[PDB]
Amino acid sequence: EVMALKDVREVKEENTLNEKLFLLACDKGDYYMVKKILEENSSGDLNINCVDVLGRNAVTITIENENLDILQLLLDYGCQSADALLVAIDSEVVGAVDILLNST
Amino acid sequence: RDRIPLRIVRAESELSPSEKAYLNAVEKGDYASVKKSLEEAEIYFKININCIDPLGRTALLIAIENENLELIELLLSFNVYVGDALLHAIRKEVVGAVELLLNQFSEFTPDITPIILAAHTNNYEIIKLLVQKGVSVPRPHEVRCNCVECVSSSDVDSLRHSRSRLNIYKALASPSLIALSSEDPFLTAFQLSWELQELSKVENEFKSEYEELSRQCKQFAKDLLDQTRSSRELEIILNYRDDLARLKLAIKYRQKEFVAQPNCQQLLASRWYDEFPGWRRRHWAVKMVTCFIIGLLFPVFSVCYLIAPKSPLGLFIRKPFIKFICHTASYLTFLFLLLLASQDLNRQGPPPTIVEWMILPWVLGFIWGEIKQMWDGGLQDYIHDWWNLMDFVMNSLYLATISLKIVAFVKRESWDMWHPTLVAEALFAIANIFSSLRLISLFTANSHLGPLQISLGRMLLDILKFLFIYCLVLLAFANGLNQLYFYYEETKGLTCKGIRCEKQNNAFSTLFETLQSLFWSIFGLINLYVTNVKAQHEFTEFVGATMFGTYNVISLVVLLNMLIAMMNNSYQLIADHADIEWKFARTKLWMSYFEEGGTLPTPFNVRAADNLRRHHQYQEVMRNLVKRYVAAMIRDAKTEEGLTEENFKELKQDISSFRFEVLGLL
Ligand SMILES: Cn1c(=O)n(CCCO)c(=O)c2c1nc(Oc1cccc(OC(F)(F)F)c1)n2Cc1ccc(Cl)cc1
Ligand SMILES: Cn1c(=O)n(CCCO)c(=O)c2c1nc(Oc1cccc(OC(F)(F)F)c1)n2Cc1ccc(Cl)cc1
Ligand SMILES: [Ca+2]
Ligand SMILES: [Zn+2]
């Protein structure tokens, strides 16, 4: 016979593909495209915060990948921190901690 | 000629200069030139789309090792020859293999499917994508399987079959596939570790690979225990059963990494010191005083729970530490009885009631305890522990002593040497030796002497492996000395024959005396004049002397120091990680004393809804565990890692592609 393999622990929900496009946009550094996605969030088709496959939030992609423009972009438009200052401390960066002042 | 001519004997394939320019532009990550080259390749030109380098670097494969998503999209757009490039994207550990999923010699084994290479590379996202596409791994056969078709496949290609089984077992033992596809990854890790151990036992070749796989599975189980963060989660995991049933399973499957976990040892120390706080915090003299007064007052707690089990004194035996203290107090009382038994003149001895009559039942209680151990575990569990073997021979000697005393009862310097009294006394002495050597197994509970005893216990195998070679050397030299020295066997005027006399004589007359003399020659207890015969034959005396000398050289100078060196290396390898072995042995002792059976020391022992709730609780807590575990290995793999040549190639090629894109724009 042949053993059948399947995702017995698939807790991650696919939801919409636009979440995946937005999460890829945070991983590429397109500031204006993520601004457009936040304008769409203001429209309301897709949410600001989406936990990915790796169990991480968008601000964690801003912090761990160490770029501050998109982090200031979601901080201007409003976003869910969800234990993100500890992640900023974890990356040993000073600037993102300073804007954050202005799983574990 | 004085010059070696050089040429390519295996010239392989060759490329056109336009094909070389195409491949070089693909390596540079160029948009415009590569797109133009494929556009002229659409019409009839020299440039072939499926150009393969003699290095096996197709433009498809080069772009896979180039990781440029736009370039690989361009190449799949005009339908290049897709061969094994999916497996190359799997090996490169790039998430861009989904593009190939949405769409000559081979570097990989023909057995390797994408899931096997994905499990080998141990990337969570790649394996998740592959199992989301819908993929079933081939079934490996059993460790002692009997299949006619698999036997015939071994007869056709044994090498390909063995490589196939190794690849399948390497795919199954991957931690990501276990965490992603298994119902119970702890049970799967245990069963897979046992299967890999038995596979390494059966397959003497490829043993290192299977041992590495088993250690990787054990490390995965230990890491999954590391990810826990609550005593409630530990109580859910270790008490799960389909009572610390999972900890029993870890004990049985020999998971020393799982068992010696600091959190698991925290739970075990909490359960062992049942309602006994501050025992380590108090002073050493104070805690030894408390241990001495509990062990001295042993009969009052052991008489309780036999008449009044619900009494607080009856419930004092419920604590496993008090049970261990009572058991060891009973054993030192047995050894005290043996000591007073060591400290008349009749053919058959009446039973010495004063000190040697209360030993009889205590031995009977020991026999009952060993019978209860025989019932709990079968024959392999009893023969697995060497201490159960020592207890078995101790009880056999004690039963033989009792039987010989009875035979003497129903039936000095005058009795035959085969009188049952003398043999009974000798058997009692050897049983006393074994019973008092039984105390060295109680050092596992202590922290200072535990690793010492465990290291000795698992270096005894190397000691025996050396003593086999010593046995062969001893037999050879004894045979030689027998053949040389047995014509001078003295028979007249000897008040004492053998080496065990005040004046040593007849040391090498027979084989048994030669074995004894060559054994005692190690410790220097055989004098030099045992090689001097009464006759004048000085040549045979010299040959015996030089044969004794050469043996003494081989035993003392060569083999003994070889044993020292082998012990040095073995103790290095053992005390590299002997602490986990000691904690495993201490957990075995503690959990043997955790059972409700055997609560009495050897003196005085002579539903579907609940299962569904436990299953859902274990499932939820272990979704939490695997989420923490994959977060941890993603975090770990992102740091303390060398970039090496491939990362520099990607980083430089991105700047090259950016420069060419800017030059195209401007
Ligand atoms: C414990 N012991 C012992 O007491 N005597 C004295 C008996 C009366 O003198 C012995 O002669 C005696 C003995 N073990 C013995 O074999 C060993 C084998 C392997 C290792 C070893 O250890 C070391 F490597 F040598 F250190 C010793 N032999 C020798 C022997 C005697 C009879 C027979 Cl059939 C076979 C072998
Ligand atoms: C095996 N052997 C021996 O049996 N006898 C006893 C013979 C009757 O007494 C010996 O005297 C004897 C002997 N090997 C001997 O030289 C060794 C050389 C190197 C190593 C060694 O080993 C160790 F380092 F010592 F361990 C020993 N010598 C000494 C000797 C005696 C006479 C002569 Cl001409 C030359 C050398
Ligand atoms: Ca036992
Ligand atoms: Zn088979």
Shape of chain B: flat
From the alpha carbons, calculate the radius of gyration of chain B and give it in angstroms: 37 Å
- What proportion of the residues of chain A form beta strands (DSSP E)? under 5%
Which chains have the largest interface? A-B, 17 and 25 residues
Count of alpha/pi helices of chain A: 6
CA(first)-CA(last) distance of chain A: 44 Å
SS-based structural class of chain A?
mainly alpha
Q: Main sheet of chain B?
A: none
What best-fitting shape of chain A do the alpha-carbon axes yield?
A: globular
Bound molecules: the ligand Cn1c(=O)n(CCCO)c(=O)c2c1nc(Oc1cccc(OC(F)(F)F)c1)n2Cc1ccc(Cl)cc1, calcium ion, zinc ion
Q: Please provide the ordered H/E string of secondary-structure elements of chain B.
A: HHHHHHHHHHHHHHHHHHHHHHHHHHHHHH
**Main sheet record of chain A:** none
What string gives the helices and strands of chain A in order?
HHHHHH
Multimeric organization:
part of a larger assembly
Distance between the termini of chain B: 59 Å
Secondary-structure content class of chain B: mainly alpha
- What is the alpha-carbon Rg of chain A in Å? 16 Å
The tally of beta strands of chain A, per DSSP, is 0
Helix content of chain A: 40-55%
Subcellular location (chain B): Cell membrane
Family (chain B): Belongs to the transient receptor (TC 1.A.4) family. STrpC subfamily. TRPC4 sub-subfamily.
GO molecular function (chain B): beta-catenin binding; cadherin binding; calcium channel activity; inositol 1,4,5 trisphosphate binding; store-operated calcium channel activity
Main location (chain B): membrane
